[PDB]
Amino acid sequence: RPTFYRQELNKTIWEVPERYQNLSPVGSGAYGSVCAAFDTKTGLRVAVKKLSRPFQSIIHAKRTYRELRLLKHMKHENVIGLLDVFTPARSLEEFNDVYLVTHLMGADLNNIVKCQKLTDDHVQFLIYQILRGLKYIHSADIIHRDLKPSNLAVNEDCELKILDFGLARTRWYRAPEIMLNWMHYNQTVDIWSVGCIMAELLTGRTLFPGTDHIDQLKLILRLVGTPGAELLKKISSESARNYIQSLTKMNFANVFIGANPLAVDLLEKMLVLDSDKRITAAQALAHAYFAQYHDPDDEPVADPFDQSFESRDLLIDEWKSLTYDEVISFVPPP
Numbered sequence: 001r002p003t004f005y006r007q008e009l010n011k012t013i014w015e016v017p018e019r020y021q022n023l024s025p026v027g028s029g030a031y032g033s034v035c036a037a038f039d040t041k042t043g044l045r046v047a048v049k050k051l052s053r054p055f056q057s058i059i060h061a062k063r064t065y066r067e068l069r070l071l072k073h074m075k076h077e078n079v080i081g082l083l084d085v086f087t088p089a090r091s092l093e094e095f096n097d098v099y100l101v102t103h104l105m106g107a108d109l110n111n112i113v114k115c116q117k118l119t120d121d122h123v124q125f126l127i128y129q130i131l132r133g134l135k136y137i138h139s140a141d142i143i144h145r146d147l148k149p150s151n152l153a154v155n156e157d158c159e160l161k162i163l164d165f166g167l168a169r170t171r172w173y174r175a176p177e178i179m180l181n182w183m184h185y186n187q188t189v190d191i192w193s194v195g196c197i198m199a200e201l202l203t204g205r206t207l208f209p210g211t212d213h214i215d216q217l218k219l220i221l222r223l224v225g226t227p228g229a230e231l232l233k234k235i236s237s238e239s240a241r242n243y244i245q246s247l248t249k250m251n252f253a254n255v256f257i258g259a260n261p262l263a264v265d266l267l268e269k270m271l272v273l274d275s276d277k278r279i280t281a282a283q284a285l286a287h288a289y290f291a292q293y294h295d296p297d298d299e300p301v302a303d304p305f306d307q308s309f310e311s312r313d314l315l316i317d318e319w320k321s322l323t324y325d326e327v328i329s330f331v332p333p334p
């Protein structure tokens with residue numbers, strides 16, 4: 001066991017191993033708060049997240065377990081992974097707090113085109129990394145569901161990692177089927193998000209900046225066009241088909257004037273209403289737009305992820321015990 005020290009942060013006592021220094025609050029959420037810190041043991045800037053009352057209820061407890069399981073699973077250059085997880089508790093009986101440590105890359109894509117659009121060469125590099133990481137996540141049978149610029153961290157060398165779990169420092173990037181509570185989501189919900197992000201990097205402007213939910217959907221329909229006959233067959237409701245026909249084309253092509261035609265071709269393949277017809281991450285990696293970076297020998301897939309817990313309805317004490325097990329078994333990365 002490491003030596004811990006105590007300090008008041010974000011309105012509670014944080015108790016952390018001595019290696020983590022210079023904690024500074026950077027965020028809080030309903031479920032946790034984050035400090036930036038410096039890990040004197042590895043020389044890395046890190047984010048330390050202290051969960052807030054991780055076992056307050058069955059739902060909190062399951063969320064805590066899910067977050068830790070997902071972070072422990074992720075071992076890929078373009079996906080955030082778990083550098084450390086700890087608790088000052090010395091037994092399951094004392095176990096009440098959980099702290100998660102991840103890389104702090106130092107910036108994200110959220111600010112990035114406020115001032116000007118990116119070059120085509122730089123968009124190739126960033127989107128390539130997003131898709132390389134998404135191929136990995138998808139191969140584990142995991143769907144991100146909330147890809148957006150603030151969930152894409154980059155360092156000074158513009159190496160990129162996909163984030164989640166409130167490490168991000170809007171519905172503009174959400175697949176329309178998620179907004180329409182469709183359920184039965186495909187992984188290509190995330191490909192829609194990548195298309196929205198890529199479009200914005202190339203043009204310097206949000207692709208679908210809706211003011212509210214229905215506005216978001218109206219903007220999408222204006223740009224990609226009304227559902228064709230094949231997609232209309234997959235929508236049960238006659239009234240819904242009538243209603244979309246009433247809101248429903250602005251040129252997709254006119255949005256991307258001056259762009260690399262290979263970029264536009266890829267955007268057209270990502271931003272397809274019918275999720276069954278969107279390009280996959282793996283397919284996208286092979287598209288000619290990425291010829292400078294694609295290497296099939298180094299676009300690795302994930303170990304399969306045991307998601308049995310997702311469908312379980314367990315008691316708090318069981319979720320808490322399962323979480324404690326995962327804390328104790330953690331082995332830090334190379």
Ligand SMILES: CCCCCCCCO[C@@H]1O[C@H](CO)[C@@H](O)[C@H](O)[C@H]1O
Nearest residue numbers: 180181182217234235236237240244
């Ligand atoms: C702006 C457009 C307004 C209406 C959007 C269409 C609503 C589609 O609705 C969805 O259709 C699916 C297929 O039948 C169902 O399985 C889903 O339960 C349902 O949510």
Ligand SMILES: CCCCCCCCO[C@@H]1O[C@H](CO)[C@@H](O)[C@H](O)[C@H]1O
Nearest residue numbers: 176177184185186234273274275276
């Ligand atoms: C903008 C208003 C219309 C939105 C239509 C969105 C259609 C998304 O696509 C749908 O996704 C479902 C879930 O994966 C699939 O089961 C369907 O087969 C697929 O067509």
